[PDB]
């Protein structure tokens, strides 16, 4: 039974609450109570899976910096029993200890050859506090194989393109990338970008 939240580094904290046992059937919310800001915020938990609930605390506009590394936010799950709100879970949330960025966007083919392709991307809603302390992983879908079989291509630096070598001519590929900052004990990878389809030239 677990309560897990991540911050996109700007103005979005997303929470998942998993119950192990008796499932709630009344209203539950996440309540955000920052220790040094003048606002509180809430979101209504909706079912997402068989035993998990989720919702997003939108703290402001998409690219606005609403928290810092010194903020501590008391996050609580409150569920309705009769007329009263019961505190069902609680954490002291350190936003820059729990980062998960948005998946990279604007994937495009820069130049494609018979055996090579340069692909670029951008990050999104990413704090200036990271400077260049980010890394990426990419992967390529081949004709034979699945996404699970595709090897993870490591970029241990802020590099927003990849030149793929030793590809086959006139072949249909798909490409994905994900990002994370190096800061934070519980920080985790973004979701994978949307796959970009591309085709090598024929020779």
């Amino acid at each position: 039974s677990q309560f897990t939240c991540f911050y996109n580094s700007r103005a979005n904290i997303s929470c998942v609450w998993s119950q192990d046992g008796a499932l709630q059937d009344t209203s539950c919310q996440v309540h955000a109570w920052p220790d040094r800001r003048r606002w509180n915020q809430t979101c209504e938990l909706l079912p997402v899976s068989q035993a998990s609930w989720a919702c997003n605390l939108i703290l402001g506009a998409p690219d606005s910096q609403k928290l810092t590394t010194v903020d501590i936010v008391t996050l609580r799950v409150l569920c309705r029993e009769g007329v009263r709100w019961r505190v069902m879970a609680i954490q002291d949330f350190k936003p820059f200890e729990n980062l998960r960025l948005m998946a990279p966007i604007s994937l495009q083919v820069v130049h494609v050859e018979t055996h090579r392709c340069n692909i670029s991307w951008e990050i999104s809603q990413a704090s200036h506090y990271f400077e260049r302390h980010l890394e990426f992983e990419a992967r390529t879908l081949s004709p034979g194989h699945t996404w699970e079989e595709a090897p993870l291509l490591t970029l241990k630096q802020k590099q927003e393109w990849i030149c793929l070598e030793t590809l086959t001519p006139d072949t249909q590929y798909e490409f994905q990338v994900r990002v994370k900052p190096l800061q934070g004990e519980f920080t985790t990878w973004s979701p994978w970008s949307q796959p970009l389809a591309f085709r090598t030239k024929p020779a």
Partner: protein
């Protein structure tokens, strides 16, 4: 009346060379350099105790590590020794004038058959440097460059085993401990094939 401009560089925070070109003077002249730091115990005006020469004339001063205070404002004074009132003073910010030595001990290792990692060392607090990595192959007509922070690693996630790679790296004292604009010399390159 107008003295030559002094230009100081702190080399790897080991010593500082301050130089000037005094061939703009009407005759050959040994100008003298004094210095002191603002807002400090080091108000006492110091005389250059290691002059540098160019065509047998003073053209610079070298300060040792002891005499360097990177974050205290540095005041350098050139003076005509035969004309006291003739003097020019500058205020330097030494933390923006650091030039690290080139990175060293470039090594490569395989993360997989087609993924390489470049690593290197600097004789310097790792945290205060950023780096520029350049690489190329025997198929390329030019270097590809990519910037790297204090982590000082560089991944190459898609390597062609048929190609021969060359790598080099340079470093800069920016932006966490200073805002220097000049890059080091390039490292000695290394190769892979």
């Amino acid at each position: 009346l107008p003295l030559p401009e002094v230009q100081c560089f702190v080399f790897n925070v080991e010593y500082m060379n301050c130089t000037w070109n005094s061939s703009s003077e009407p005759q050959p002249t040994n100008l003298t350099l004094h210095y002191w730091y603002k807002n400090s115990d080091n108000d006492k005006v110091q005389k250059c105790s290691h002059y540098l020469f160019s065509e047998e004339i003073t053209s610079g001063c070298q300060l040792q590590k002891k005499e360097i205070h990177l974050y205290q404002t540095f005041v350098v004074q050139l003076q005509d020794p035969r004309e006291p009132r003739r003097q020019a003073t500058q205020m330097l910010k030494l933390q923006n004038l650091v030039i690290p030595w080139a990175p060293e001990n470039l090594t490569l290792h395989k993360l997989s058959e087609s993924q390489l990692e470049l690593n290197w060392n600097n004789r310097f607090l790792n945290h205060c440097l950023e780096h520029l990595v350049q690489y190329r192959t025997d198929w390329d007509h030019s270097w590809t460059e990519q910037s790297v922070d204090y982590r000082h690693k560089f991944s190459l996630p898609s390597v062609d085993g048929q190609k021969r790679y060359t790598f080099r790296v340079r470093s800069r004292f920016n932006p966490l401990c200073g805002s220097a604009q000049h890059w080091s010399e390039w490292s000695h390159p290394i190769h892979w094939g």
